[PDB]
Amino acid sequence: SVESVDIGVETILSGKARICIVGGYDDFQEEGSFEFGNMKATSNTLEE
Amino acid sequence: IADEPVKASLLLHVLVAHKLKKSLDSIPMSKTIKDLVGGKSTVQNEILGDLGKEF
Amino acid sequence: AMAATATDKIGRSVPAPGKGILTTAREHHSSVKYASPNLNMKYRKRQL
Numbered sequence: 095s096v097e098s099v100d101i102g103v104e105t106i107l108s109g110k111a112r113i114c115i116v117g118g119y120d121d122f123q124e125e126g127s128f129e130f131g132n133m134k135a136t137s138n139t140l141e142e
Numbered sequence: 143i144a145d146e147p148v149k150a151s152l153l154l155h156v157l158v159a160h161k162l163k164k165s166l167d168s169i170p171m172s173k174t175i176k177d178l179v180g181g182k183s184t185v186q187n188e189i190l191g192d193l194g195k196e197f
Numbered sequence: 198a199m200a201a202t203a204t205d206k207i208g209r210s211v212p213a214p215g216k217g218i219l220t221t222a223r224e225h226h227s228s229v230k231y232a233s234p235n236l237n238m239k240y241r242k243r244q245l
């Protein structure tokens with residue numbers, strides 16, 4: 095999202111765009127939930 | 143032949159050899175867990191999660 | 198006003214956060230006895 099904003103700004107000052115949509119978006123599914131669990135990045139809910 | 147229950151030296155050396163994807167020869171027992179991994183905290187956290195569950 | 202991105206340094210851990218965004222506060226403080234007239238807006242307007 096912050097990279098998006100940066101790319102967005104520098105696109106406007108370059109004089110390539112006067113307006114820019116800027117943002118970010120991400121979905122939660124089974125397989126990422128699992129892979130973040132194996133990295134031990136996410137809170138283990140049973141400890142919680 | 144006689145009966146010997148497994149050494150804690152043989153069993154500790156296998157769960158560090160199996161995790162790092164190496165033979166028993168390639169790993170010295172004198173080397174630390176932090177040395178053998180390199181700079182990967184995820185592999186070092188995953189070896190101390192095996193020995194906490196095992197022993 | 199500002200938007201920036203920064204890598205960190207040599208390492209062997211992709212998910213470890215770092216300090217490379219400190220470079221947004223990078224300034225030189227060797228010669229810091231007297232004021233910069235460039236910071237004072239009055240000066241900058243007189244020049245314009």
Ligand SMILES: *P(=O)(O)OCC(C)(C)[C@@H](O)C(N)=O
Nearest residue numbers: 133135183184210212213214
């Ligand atoms: P290493 O020292 O790279 O640490 C990896 C972990 C998963 C601990 C870190 O990225 C985190 N999620 O806090």
